[PDB]
């Protein structure tokens, strides 16, 4: 205690001197620079398609690089690969554990990942010799529930888990090449950078952390949220990211500035945020809420551009195509709707 | 040309046929969340019901059940408990003899009852280890009044139906613990979800007809609620 008091003080005083460094950089605010530019105005998207076929609530989804195929995970044991243009179902994968909490689609379009309370990001081979879909290999080693696993490459995948730990995996060997420790609460979301050199992850401690993939060290940690961070997504250029939380607020964080640029909050909204996503240009900021709605935000002026009100239960997941052509919205009502 | 579209539309029918078959099995089965503590005695109930997460299937009167025990996680349970917002019932097991840990179980019951995503789920309460409670009460070593001061002014309910042979002092303590859990249930959720308390021991031979009867009553009340008749 005599020496452990110093350790608390050493962390506190060093954390204190970081704040004044960030305060010096904050000369202006994002609202001041972007006040001159004209607003986007009214945004009115329409439900182009509504995908039906899931039995239980759809809990996660992911677009493909071709911006046509989707994968959606539901809490009944199915991993359905859809086709946006024709609404047809390409594949239906029965899972071992019905409580699947995440899904990912490979950039090559060959493998699909999923996982949940079974603690495994199972890899599924879509393009096999017999044409079927079978479990490629199971990546076990997490001690808490799998919350998000995303394909870094055809043979690499990063995972988040409810054991306060992220991990980089080698799908060929099946072992953790790099472990990412430092979060205190359950890690809920994960987002890769466009260059796939860094990634951010929000956890259940009201903090986000920037990780280096090839090193495994935390570059910097971002704070400002009052409650659990549920969603996270990079800005298209890769220099910023947004975070949705239970505060009913979204926050924009800049990597280089190391500060919170803007807060997207309205007094009417008192419900948590489940998913966030940017448009192709990065002007719009999509956000899925607990009040069964999706709000379009002006990322530069922090104004509600529009509302996507088409779901009966809570919006669980969101996604925007790589060409930015459409946005899809999964919900707990088991319906996946495409908006454009 | 159109061969790909014909293949794609023909393929979608094959998935659609399977999804309809899987719907029949999914709707027939009843999912149950087995929740409890280390000392509650969850494994005793699972073991005697001989028909990351552990599943237990048991068929009663040609009705498939699916009990889910979630023990491969950490003590923070506010993020994966949302995965069970549509279970038929939550089987809450408590250790009645463990006096000092009853408030911990009462707090967990209050959180599940008042959770936004679990407000619709009914709780099948199992007050496990009744024989150890009777031993502790008759021995006179530990007292409820130290841990629950309101017990000293507690009168046994009139509708009590004790087992053949039970000390009135034992019955008073047995029905006070039940009343503590039922106090939380009646304070909120008017008609949306109920609680089914049961006194059980490690030698309760069936212990599954009670779940079968409770799940039957849950579905019946759910149908009546859609008609706004109850």
């Amino acid at each position: 205690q005599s020496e452990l008091d110093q350790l608390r003080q050493e962390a506190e005083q060093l954390k204190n001197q970081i704040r004044d460094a960030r305060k010096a950089c904050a000369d202006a605010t994002l609202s001041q620079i972007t006040n001159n530019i004209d607003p986007v105005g009214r945004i009115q998207m329409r439900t182009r398609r509504t995908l039906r076929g899931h039995l239980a609530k759809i809990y996660a989804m992911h677009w493909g690089t071709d911006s046509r195929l989707l994968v959606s995970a539901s809490q009944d044991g199915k991993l359905i690969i859809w086709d946006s243009y024709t609404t047809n179902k390409v594949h239906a994968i029965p899972l071992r554990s019905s409580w699947v909490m995440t899904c990912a689609y490979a950039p090559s379009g060959n493998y699909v990942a999923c996982g949940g309370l079974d603690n495994i990001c199972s890899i599924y081979n879509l393009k096999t010799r017999e044409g079927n879909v079978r479990v490629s290999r199971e990546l076990a080693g997490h001690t808490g529930y799998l919350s998000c696993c995303r394909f870094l490459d055809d043979n690499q995948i990063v995972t988040s888990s409810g054991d306060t730990t992220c991990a980089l995996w080698d799908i060929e060997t099946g072992q953790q090449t790099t472990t990412f420790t430092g979060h205190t609460g359950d890690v809920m979301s994960l987002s890769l950078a466009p260059d796939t050199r860094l990634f951010v992850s929000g956890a259940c401690d009201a903090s986000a952390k920037l990780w280096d993939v090839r090193e495994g060290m935390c570059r910097q940690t971002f704070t400002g949220h009052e409650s659990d961070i549920n969603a996270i997504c990079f800005f298209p250029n890769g220099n910023a990211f947004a975070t949705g939380s239970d505060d009913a607020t979204c926050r924009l964080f800049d990597l280089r500035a190391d500060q919170e640029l803007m807060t997207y909050s309205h007094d009417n909204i008192i419900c948590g945020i489940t998913s966030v996503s940017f448009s192709k240009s990065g002007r719009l900021l999509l956000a899925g809420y607990d009040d069964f709605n999706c709000n379009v935000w002006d990322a530069l002026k922090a104004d509600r551009a529009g509302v996507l009100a088409g779901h009966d239960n809570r919006v669980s997941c969101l996604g925007v195509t790589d060409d930015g052509m459409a946005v899809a919205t999964g919900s707990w009502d088991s319906f996946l709707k495409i908006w454009n | 040309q159109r061969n790909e579209e014909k293949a794609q539309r023909e393929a979608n029918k094959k998935i659609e046929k399977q999804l309809q078959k899987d719907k029949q099995v999914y709707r027939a089965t009843h999912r149950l969340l087995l929740l409890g503590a280390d000392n509650s005695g969850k494994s005793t109930i699972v073991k005697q019901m001989r028909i990351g997460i552990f599943e237990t299937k048991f068929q009663v009167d040609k009705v498939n059940f699916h009990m889910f025990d979630v023990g491969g996680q950490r003590d923070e349970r506010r993020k994966w408990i949302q995965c069970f917002n549509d279970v038929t019932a939550i089987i809450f097991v408590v250790d009645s003899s463990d006096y000092n840990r009853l408030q911990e179980a009462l707090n967990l019951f209050k959180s599940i009852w008042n959770n936004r995503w679990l407000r619709t789920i009914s709780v099948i309460l199992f007050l496990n280890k009744q024989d150890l409670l009777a031993e502790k009460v008759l021995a006179g070593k530990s007292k409820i009044e130290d841990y629950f001061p309101e017990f000293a002014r507690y009168t046994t309910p009139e509708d009590a139906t004790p087992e053949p042979g039970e000390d009135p002092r034992v019955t008073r303590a047995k029905y006070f613990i039940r009343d503590e859990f039922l106090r939380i249930s009646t304070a909120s959720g008017d008609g949306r979800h109920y609680c089914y308390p049961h006194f059980t021991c490690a030698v309760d031979t069936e212990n599954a007809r009670r779940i079968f009867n409770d799940c039957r009553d849950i579905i019946q009340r759910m149908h009546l609620r859609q008609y706004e008749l109850l």
Partner: nanobody, 128 residues
Framework: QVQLQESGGGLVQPGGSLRLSCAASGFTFSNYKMNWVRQAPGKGLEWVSDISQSGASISYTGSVKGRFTISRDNAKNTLYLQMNSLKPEDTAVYYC?????????????????????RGQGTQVTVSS
């Protein structure tokens, strides 16, 4: 940065009194339900008392009814716990756990070993 800094606590004879003070920062104190928890030497974390957002539900753990009383001041952004007759069994490290969500009456995981929204705690000792 969500922070909870406990105050008060120390040595006290049996039968005395001790006023705890919990200074909150980094969040809107008025929206959240606050709790007091403690960890006795050689025992796990135990819930002591909670208070509603407005300060209406003032439930206690039963072992401390009559002796302990929790207070709340949303203007000053602080939590209180006025202990009136300390017994030797009360010796524990009293934390100031805050509920996770800002508009909920249920409160989860405040007694967990690594809860993020709980303070460092203040030591309370009772001895003769």
């Amino acid at each position: 940065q969500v922070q909870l800094q406990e105050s008060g606590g120390g040595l006290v004879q049996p039968g005395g009194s001790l006023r705890l003070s919990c200074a909150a920062s980094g969040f809107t104190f008025s929206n959240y339900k606050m709790n007091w928890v403690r960890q006795a030497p050689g025992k796990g974390l135990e819930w002591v008392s909670d208070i509603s957002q407005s300060g209406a539900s003032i439930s206690y753990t039963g072992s401390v009814k009559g002796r302990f009383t929790i207070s709340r001041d949303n203007a000053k952004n602080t939590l209180y716990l006025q202990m009136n007759s300390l017994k030797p069994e009360d010796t524990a490290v009293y934390y100031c756990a805050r509920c996770p969500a800002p508009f909920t009456r249920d409160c989860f995981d405040v007694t967990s070993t690594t809860y993020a929204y709980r303070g460092q705690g203040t030591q309370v000792t009772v001895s003769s």
